[PDB]
Amino acid sequence: QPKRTKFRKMHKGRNRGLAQGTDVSFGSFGLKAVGRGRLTARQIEAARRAMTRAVKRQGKIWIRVFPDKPITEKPLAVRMGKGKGNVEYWVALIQPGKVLYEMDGVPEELAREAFKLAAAKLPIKTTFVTK
Amino acid sequence: KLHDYYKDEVVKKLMTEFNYNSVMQVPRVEKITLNMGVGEAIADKKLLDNAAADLAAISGQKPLITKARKSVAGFKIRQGYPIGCKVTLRGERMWEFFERLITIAVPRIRDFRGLSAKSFDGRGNYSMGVREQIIFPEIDYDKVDRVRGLDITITTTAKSDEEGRALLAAFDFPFRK
Amino acid sequence: AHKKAGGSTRNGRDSEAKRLGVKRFGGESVLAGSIIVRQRGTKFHAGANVGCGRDHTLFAKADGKVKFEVKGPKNRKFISIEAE
Amino acid sequence: MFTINAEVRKEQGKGASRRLRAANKFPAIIYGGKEAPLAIELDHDKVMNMQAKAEFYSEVLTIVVDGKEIKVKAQDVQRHPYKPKLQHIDFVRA
Amino acid sequence: KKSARIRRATRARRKLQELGATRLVVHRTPRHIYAQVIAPNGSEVLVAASTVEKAIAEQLKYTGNKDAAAAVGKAVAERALEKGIKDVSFDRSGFQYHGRVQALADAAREAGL
RNA sequence: AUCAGGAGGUUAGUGCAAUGGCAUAAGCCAGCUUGACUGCGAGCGUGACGGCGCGAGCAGGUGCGAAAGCAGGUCAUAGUG
RNA sequence: GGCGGCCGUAGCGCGGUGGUCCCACCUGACCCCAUGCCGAACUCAGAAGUGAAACGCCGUAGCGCCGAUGGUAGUGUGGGGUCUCCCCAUGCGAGAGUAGGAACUGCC
Structure with a gap:
């Protein structure tokens, strides 16, 4: 699927947004996912809102990858109208070795349980990384 | 005459006791x-006649009538209307009209003041404020219709309020505080 | 009137350009090659364009410009057979 | 002062490197100003556990290549993708 | 190609380089006048003479007039013919007509160039 | 609105749908002036095929320029049978 | 400052310092000559005053550009397996990184 964006027509809005956590200090942690895959904005919200709703203990939870690749669909016959932007909103491109969610935290992992809850929402076997 | 000493003598003095820098x-x-x-x-269609007719006596040559650039904007302006009419030239002329202007005929008006308010603030271009009735040694006393009163400016490249005006009060008076 | 809808060029036809002028045999003072019109300067072999380089050779004939900013638009300095 | 054993990179290549990584060994390059750069073959197991210790990059590592030490410090470490391991590390004589 | 700094000042001339000959630059100073016969590839000056050198002969009046510009042309050209050059083009970078440069050129031909 | 100063390769502008080119400029302003000349060839369009077009000479001559030089209409590619 | 050589690593910014030899600024416009409106341009003349803009030297490598020592991803090419897919052989190696050059050289 040739990477896409817009410069076309305006579609729906972002189901995501709340970056959460404080960004006064930049860290280098994360949660890598072995395997490339396209994740829609919605599923990203469910996973993000899953951990954020569990890491009430603190914060410093952040995400680097965001959906920037639109995908249109077409319901009915066919013969006039390339594609409209429906349920299929922006989608993020994840690399075989890309870090998605990283939380600035020293060995006190209380979010591993949160990342686990989210790891069951995105279609891809993710693994927990300390580095 | 009294104009050459201001660019070789009374220019280094006003740059020693309160400046400490270079020469230029x-x-x-x-x-x-x-x-x-x-x-x-x-x-209406007039005044332009009596114009350039009196502005050609105190100096040489005659003003030119130039228009603006044909480019309509957000204002009531047509295409091809004489506006501005400005002409400035030098070479060695703008040096004497700084002598016979602030020496004679003044003080010699009718009700001259003496104290002037702080014209500029943080720039170089000063200011002015003359009335309509003036008496000059280079103008007839009885034959001129409609008295004219034009301002007077001076371009300078200063950097601070002080260090300046100290050269203006070096020949052009009065000016009390 | 004015233009709109941002984009690159604007689609055309099939490129009409060749590359005549062996410049290693007989060569009458004329346009050596064909791609873009209007250009002067080179009076002999002056094949010089950014890259690995360029070249031509042998042919005694005064003047001989190129096509334009293409196959060595730069103007070198003289060149002929070996002893015309 | 961590003491590690190593050799010299003769067959410099990705193919030869993979045969070493399979035997728990990875390449490395050492430089030191006037000293001519040198590519060696360090032990994977050892270095891996030693690089985990922060002080690893601050110590004057005593790498004994073949039969003699060199004494250098760690700079950067290139990790492997699909399998979390050491791919290549840079060093500087100290 | 783009226009070099020299071409932007149009002081040079590529049309005179395509021939493969020499030039006859005419430098002018509010005190003296100079002329040279420089050849391509750098600033190779074969022969040259200054109006100040004209005094060596027997010059009295000022050296910043027209009659002086013509005297220099005859000198620079005379020395040129002694060198081995016959043809030469005029190269007056920025100047008016009928000026001192014209008198310099007219003087060069008077010699044999 | 205008004017003065500073920053500013230029995103301006250049007739036209776009790309490419250009600033002590093919851009702008002003002045001047007007080569859109005649005749005849060589070359260019994988693969032969006309009209037409274009680049580049020669012979004789119009315009402008000091001259080289520039033109076969309007920077090039649609406005034709 | 004069006078040469090499002669696009001399694009473009920036620093120190020196010669009243030289040179722009500057200064003055009587005249040749010239500005459609303005000796500003143009052109001519003298040199009070500096080096604030040249030039001679010489100190930074930013950025452009031209070379050199080291190498992962990517990629050329031909066989292997494998659900997709991936691997191997072989010629190189993104781009990052370590360095070279801000003139060089003779004479008065």
Whole structure:
């Protein structure tokens, strides 16, 4: 699927947004996912809102990858109208070795349980990384 | 005459006791622009005649009638309407009209003040404020209809309020505080 | 009137350009090659364009410009057979 | 002062490197100003556990290549993708 | 190609380089006048003479007039013919007509160039 | 609105749908002036095929320029049978 | 400052310092000559005053550009397996990184 964006027509809005956590200090942690895959904005919200709703203990939870690749669909016959932007909103491109969610935290992992809850929402076997 | 000493003698002195720097920058040549009073509105097709007719007596040559750039904007302006009419030139002329202007005929008006308010604030271009009735040694006393009163400007490249005006009060008076 | 809808060029036809002028045999003073019109300067072999280089050779004939900013638009300095 | 054993990179290549990584060994390059750069073959197991210790990059590592030490410090470490391991590390004589 | 700084000042001339000959630059100073016969590839000056050198002969009046510009042309050209050059083009970078440069050129031909 | 100063390769502008080119400029302003000349060839369009077009000479001559030089209409590619 | 050589690593910014030898600024416009409106341009003349803009030297490598020592991803090419897919052989190696050059050289 040739990477896409817009410069076309305006579609729906972002189901995501709340970056959460404080960004006064930049860290280098994360949660890598072995395997490339396209994740829609919605599923990203469910996973993000899953951990954020569990890491009430603190914060410093952040995400680097965001959906920037639109995908249109077409319901009915066919013969006039390339594609409209429906349920299929922006989608993020994840690399075989890309870090998605990283939380600035020293060995006190209380979010591993949160990342686990989210790891069951995105279609891809993710693994927990300390580095 | 009394004008050459101001660019070799009374220029180093005003740069020693309260400056401490080089020789240049304070103060050159470059033409001096002499604008005219807005002739628009006053009357109709006229005044332009008595104009350039009196502005050609105190100096040489005659003003030119130039228009603006044909480019309509957000204002009531047509295409091809004489406006501005400005002409400035030098070479060695703008040096004497700084003598016979502030020496004679003044103080010699009728009700001259003496104290002037702080014209500029943080710039170089000063200011002015003369009335309509003036008496000059280079103008007839009885034969001129409609008295004219044009301002007087001076371009300078200063950097601070002080260090300046100290050269103006070196020949052009009065000026009390 | 004015233009709109941002984009690159604007689609055309099939490129009409060749590359005549062996410049290693007989060569009458004329346009050596064909791609873009209007250009002067080179009076002999002056094949010189950014890259690995360029070249031509042998042919005694005064003047001989190129096509334009293409196959060595730069103007070198003289060149002929070996002893015309 | 961590003491590690190593050799010299003769067959410099990705193919030869993979045969070493399979035997728990990875390449490395050492430089030191006037000293001519040198590519060696360090032990994977050892270095891996030693690089985990922060002080690893601050110590004057005593790498004994073949039969003699060199004494250098760690700079950067290139990790492997699909399998979390050491791919290549840079060093500087100290 | 783009226009070099020299081409932007149009002081040079590529049309005179395509021939493969020499030039006859005419430098002018509010005090003296100079002329040279420089050849391509750098600033190779074969022969040259200054109006100040004209005094060596027997010059009295000023050296910043027209009659002086013509005297220099005859000198620079005379020395040129002694060198081995016959033809030469005029190269006056920025100047008016009928000026001192014209008198310099007219003087060069008077010699044999 | 205008004018003065500073920053500013230029995103301006250049007739036209776009790309490419250009600033002590093919851009702008002003002045001047007007080569859109005649005749005849060589070359260019994988693969032969006309009209037409274009680049580049020669012979004789119009315009402008000091001259080289520039033109076969308007920077090039649609406005034709 | 004069006078040469090499002669696009001399694009473009920036620093120190020196010669009243030289040179722009500057200064003055009587005249040749010239500005459609303005000796500003143009052109001519003298040199009070500096080096604030040249030039001679010489100190930074930013950025452009031209070379050199080291190498992962990517990629050329031909066989292997494998659900997709991936691997191997072989010629190189993104781009990052370590360095070279801000003139060089003779004479008065």
